[PDB]
Enzyme design. Structure first.
Site, PDB file in Angstrom:
ATOM      1  N   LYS A 202       0.810  -1.216   0.000  1.00  0.00           N
ATOM      2  CA  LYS A 202       0.000   0.000   0.000  1.00  0.00           C
ATOM      3  C   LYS A 202       0.853   1.280   0.000  1.00  0.00           C
ATOM      4  O   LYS A 202       2.085   1.241   0.113  1.00  0.00           O
ATOM      5  CB  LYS A 202      -0.961  -0.013   1.176  1.00  0.00           C
ATOM      6  CG  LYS A 202      -2.072  -1.057   0.943  1.00  0.00           C
ATOM      7  CD  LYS A 202      -3.221  -0.867   1.904  1.00  0.00           C
ATOM      8  CE  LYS A 202      -4.387  -1.853   1.626  1.00  0.00           C
ATOM      9  NZ  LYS A 202      -5.317  -1.766   2.779  1.00  0.00           N
ATOM     10  N   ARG A 236      -3.321  -9.696   5.963  1.00  0.00           N
ATOM     11  CA  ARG A 236      -3.759  -9.918   4.586  1.00  0.00           C
ATOM     12  C   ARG A 236      -2.686  -9.425   3.643  1.00  0.00           C
ATOM     13  O   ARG A 236      -2.301  -8.249   3.705  1.00  0.00           O
ATOM     14  CB  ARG A 236      -5.088  -9.188   4.337  1.00  0.00           C
ATOM     15  CG  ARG A 236      -5.604  -9.234   2.924  1.00  0.00           C
ATOM     16  CD  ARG A 236      -6.926  -8.433   2.855  1.00  0.00           C
ATOM     17  NE  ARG A 236      -7.585  -8.587   1.560  1.00  0.00           N
ATOM     18  CZ  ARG A 236      -7.274  -7.905   0.461  1.00  0.00           C
ATOM     19  NH1 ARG A 236      -6.334  -6.952   0.469  1.00  0.00           N
ATOM     20  NH2 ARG A 236      -7.946  -8.145  -0.655  1.00  0.00           N
TER      21      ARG A 236
END
Ligand SMILES: CNc1nc(N)[nH]c(=O)c1N=O
Ligand SMILES: CNc1nc(N)[nH]c(=O)c1N=O
Ligand code: NA
Ligand code: NA
Lengths: 257, 249
Positions: A202, A236
């Site tokens: 991210k 995750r």
């Protein structure tokens, strides 16, 4: 701490790696990618489309059913691994449970019409994520959001023990907000509920390091290890093998503690 | 804020530093400088020069020209892996910043040579492994102080590996932050070691994820210097750690 779904349980006494399975023959490819992730040590496979990335094409209920349900079914027929489904649509929630999904992973926290009821009907565990869009400092904001959403779920007949909390890294949060939430992640344990986090590749890594999406493994592992040392239960990720390796080191350390 | 001082410069330890491993054990000199340059560009702020018991003349021949070359060309801090008084003395003369002795100056004359240099020294430890290591530090700090080495010159390293078993290594890692009571820099070296290899079942070249995990666990506990083979990835992991610790207000 345990989760219960489909007459089985997941032992949250150690961190679990949840592997991302993006399904946007696709089916045969999806099963092989799932197999690779299981072999690499993933204990939850997270099935979804592209459409949970900010900017991505929205899709119909029909397309989501066509893409997700057969993959969930195919995994349940081949493997004993836990399966999470990335959806906000009540009919996908309903149909996924019927073919063996263990966790409803809704980044919109069941805010879409009918989703709350469908989730309640399945009796499955549900992950609630903080997002700006979803119906002082950022910790307090997220903490207040969790209080509110736990209340909403419980009012619909969803037991607290079915809930997981995710502070929602990314989704437009700026750098300081993301790292504040990571630095204070352990404070969210006051709810006595599983914490799920997703930081893999991210912006909080990309922007910090100023590197492209394929150059974020080291930063992603660092985020994963920081979260897991604070007792995050599910991580995750895209890169299962390397994350599982890092979690072995984390587990050795927390065990020694 | 914690700093070290050497050769007219200072090292600010308010954030973790990555120390890159530079093994000179056998031209060799040209290749040593090239490797040093790569690690500096990758973000190492200390280069750890070691060439190994080999004779002291061998060690001087391998190590001193490399230290000197790096000191002449770069501004990076240099640590020298040695136990021998002659190498301690000569390293200091050609610009080294830290004496990194895994034997904590136990060899004859080493303590006096280290004191005379005035350089920072890293002391490494080699039923209750935490208590044994903690007691060791207490004793070695007193030893150094008695020899005229100010406490502010010392670094402490619990000595991961070196035959410590898996359980003992991870007990030390889990409790690393408790060594902050000394108010001294903590230096750690876990990169590619057996405490990773035994868990991961992968060869030395395949251990990066484990090496990074060790580095992050140590740094989140306030370790000041992380000694590693893989500089660029560790430096990235440390930026993530720094962003997190900074956010903790
Ligand atoms: C479906 N995608 C995600 N799900 C969850 N729970 N958390 C994330 O960060 C996330 N990020 O993409
Ligand atoms: C020269 N080698 C080392 N030095 C220090 N200080 N710490 C280590 O773990 C180490 N391991 O090899
Ligand atoms: Na990968
Ligand atoms: Na490397």
């Amino acid at each position: 701490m345990k989760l219960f779904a489909q007459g089985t349980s997941l032992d949250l006494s150690h961190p679990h790696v949840m592997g991302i399975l993006n399904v946007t023959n696709s089916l045969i490819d999806a099963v092989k990618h799932a197999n690779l992730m299981i072999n690499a040590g993933a204990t939850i496979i997270d099935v979804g489309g592209e459409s949970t990335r900010p900017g991505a094409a929205e899709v119909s209920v029909e397309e989501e059913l066509q893409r997700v349900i057969p993959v969930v079914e195919a995994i349940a027929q081949r493997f004993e691994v836990w399966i999470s489904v990335d959806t906000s649509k009540p009919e996908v929630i309903r149909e996924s449970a019927k073919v063996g999904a263990h966790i409803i992973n809704d980044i919109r926290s069941l805010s879409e019409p009918g989703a709350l009821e469908a989730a309640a009907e399945t009796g499955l565990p549900v992950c609630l994520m903080h997002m700006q869009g979803n119906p002082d400092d950022v910790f307090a904001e997220v903490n207040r959001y969790f209080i509110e959403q736990i209340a909403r779920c419980e009012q619909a007949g969803i037991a607290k023990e079915k809930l997981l909390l995710d502070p929602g890294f990314g989704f437009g949060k700026n750098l300081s907000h993301n790292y504040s939430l990571l630095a204070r992640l352990a404070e969210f344990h006051h709810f006595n509920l599983p914490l799920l986090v997703g930081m893999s590749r991210k912006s909080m890594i990309g922007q910090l390091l100023n590197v492209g999406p394929s150059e974020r493994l080291s930063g992603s592992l660092a985020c994963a290890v920081i979260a897991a040392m604070q007792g995050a239960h599910i991580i995750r990720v895209h890169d299962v093998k390397e994350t599982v390796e890092a979690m072995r080191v984390v587990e050795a350390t927390l065990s020694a503690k």
